[PDB]
Amino acid sequence: MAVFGAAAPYLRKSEKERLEAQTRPFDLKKDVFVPDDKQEFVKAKIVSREGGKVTAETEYGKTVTVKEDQVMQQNPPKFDKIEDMAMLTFLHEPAVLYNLKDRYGSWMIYTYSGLFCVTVNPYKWLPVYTPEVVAAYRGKKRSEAPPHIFSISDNAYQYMLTDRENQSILITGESGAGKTVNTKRVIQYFAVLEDQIIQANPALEAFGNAKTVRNDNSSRFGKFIRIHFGATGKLASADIETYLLEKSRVIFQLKAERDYHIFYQILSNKKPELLDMLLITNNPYDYAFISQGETTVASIDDAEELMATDNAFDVLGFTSEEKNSMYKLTGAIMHFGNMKFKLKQREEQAEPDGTEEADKSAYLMGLNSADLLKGLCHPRVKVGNEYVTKGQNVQQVIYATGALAKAVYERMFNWMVTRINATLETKQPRQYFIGVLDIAGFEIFDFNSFEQLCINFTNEKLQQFFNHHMFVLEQEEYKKEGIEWTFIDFGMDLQACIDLIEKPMGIMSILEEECMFPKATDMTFKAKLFDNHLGKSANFQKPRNIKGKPEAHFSLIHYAGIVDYNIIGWLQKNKDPLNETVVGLYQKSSLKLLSTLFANKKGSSFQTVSALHRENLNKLMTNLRSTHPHFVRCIIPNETKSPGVMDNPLVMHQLRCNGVLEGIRICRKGFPNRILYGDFRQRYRILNPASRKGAEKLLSSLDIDHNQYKFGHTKVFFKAGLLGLLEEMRDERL
Ligand SMILES: Nc1ncnc2c1ncn2[C@@H]1O[C@H](COP(=O)(O)OP(=O)(O)O)[C@@H](O)[C@H]1O
Ligand SMILES: [Mg+2]
Instruction: Give the distance, in angstroms, between the CA of residue 29 and the centroid of all CA atoms in the same chain.
Output: 41
User: Cα of 214 to ligand 2 centre, how many Å?
Assistant: 14
Q: Is the dihedral of CA 634, 624, 618, 401 positive or negative?
A: positive
Helices of type H across 380-449: 394-424
SS3 of 31, please? Answer: strand
CATH code of the domain covering residue 696: 1.20.58.60
User: Cα of 210 to ligand 2 centre, how many Å?
Assistant: 11
Q: Where are the beta strands (DSSP E) in 607-665?
A: 628-635
Query: The domain containing residue 709 runs over which residues?
Result: 669-733
Q: Where are the beta strands (DSSP E) in 418-539?
A: 431-440
Q: Is the CB of 176 under 6 A from ligand 1?
A: yes
**Angle made by CA atoms 114, 117, 120, in degrees to the nearest 5:** 135
- Identify the bridge partners of residue 554 per DSSP, sorted by sequence position: 565
179 annotated binding-site participant = yes
User: Residue 319 and residue 26: Cα distance in Å, rounded?
Assistant: 67
User: Residue 499 and residue 220: Cα distance in Å, rounded?
Assistant: 25
SS3 of 252, please? Answer: coil
User: Count of CB atoms within 10 A of residue 631's CB?
Assistant: 23
Query: Which residues are placed with Cβ below 5 angstroms of ligand 2, an ion?
Result: 179-180, 219
Cβ-based burial of 394 (10 A; exposed 0-12, middle 13-18, buried ≥19): middle
Question: For residue 50, what is the enclosing H or E element?
Answer: strand 42-50
**Helix orientation angle between 321-335 and 357-365, rounded to the nearest 10 degrees:** 160
Give the resolution to one decimal, in Å: 3.3
176 annotated binding-site participant = yes
User: Residue 712 and residue 2: Cα distance in Å, rounded?
Assistant: 36
Identify the active-site residue in 57, 155, 176, 616. 176
Q: Is the CB of 47 under 6 A from ligand 1?
A: no
Which atom of ligand 1 is nearest the CA belonging to 176? 22
585: nearest Cα among 366, 430, 260:
366
175 annotated binding-site participant = yes
Which are the contacts of 108, defined by CB distance < 8 A and separation ≥ 6? 10, 11, 13, 147
Name the residue of 180, 183, 299 whose CB sits within 8 Å of the most ligand 1 atoms, as the mutation to test its pocket. 180
User: Residue 247 and residue 573: Cα distance in Å, rounded?
Assistant: 9
247: nearest Cα among 362, 392, 412:
412
Name the amino acid, one letter, at 47: V
User: Cα of 428 to ligand 2 centre, how many Å?
Assistant: 29
380: nearest Cα among 231, 581, 214, 198:
581
Strands 350-351 and 380-383: unpaired
Q: Is the CB of 178 under 6 A from ligand 1?
A: yes
583: nearest Cα among 593, 568, 573, 572:
593
Q: Kindly write down the DSSP assignment for every residue of 110-178, as one continuous string.
A: EEEETTEEEEE--SS--GGG-HHHHHHHTT--TTTSPSSHHHHHHHHHHHHHHT---EEEEEEESTTS-
Which atom of ligand 1 is nearest the CA belonging to 219? 23
Query: Are the CB atoms for 104 and 646 separated by under 8 Å?
Result: yes
Identify the active-site residue in 151, 182, 218, 361. 218
- Identify the bridge partners of residue 382 per DSSP, sorted by sequence position: 387
SS3 of 434, please? Answer: strand
User: Residue 646 and residue 559: Cα distance in Å, rounded?
Assistant: 24
Q: Where are the beta strands (DSSP E) in 278-405?
A: 342-343, 350-351, 380-383, 386-389
Conformation bin of residue 36: beta by default, left when phi > 0, alpha when psi is -120 to 50 = beta
Conformation bin of residue 84: beta by default, left when phi > 0, alpha when psi is -120 to 50 = beta
**Helix orientation angle between 394-424 and 321-335, rounded to the nearest 10 degrees:** 160
SS3 letters for 658-713? Answer: HCHHHHHHHHHHCCCEEEEHHHHHHHHHHHCCCCHHHHHHHHHCCCCCCCCEECCC
Length of the chain: 734
User: Residue 363 and residue 278: Cα distance in Å, rounded?
Assistant: 10
Which are the contacts of 439, defined by CB distance < 8 A and separation ≥ 6? 172, 222, 223, 244, 458, 459, 462
Question: For residue 629, what is the enclosing H or E element?
Answer: strand 628-635
Query: Are the CB atoms for 307 and 202 separated by under 8 Å?
Result: no
Identify the active-site residue in 58, 89, 155, 215. 215
Q: Is the CB of 181 under 6 A from ligand 1?
A: yes
SS3 of 428, please? Answer: coil
Query: Are the CB atoms for 555 and 542 separated by under 8 Å?
Result: yes
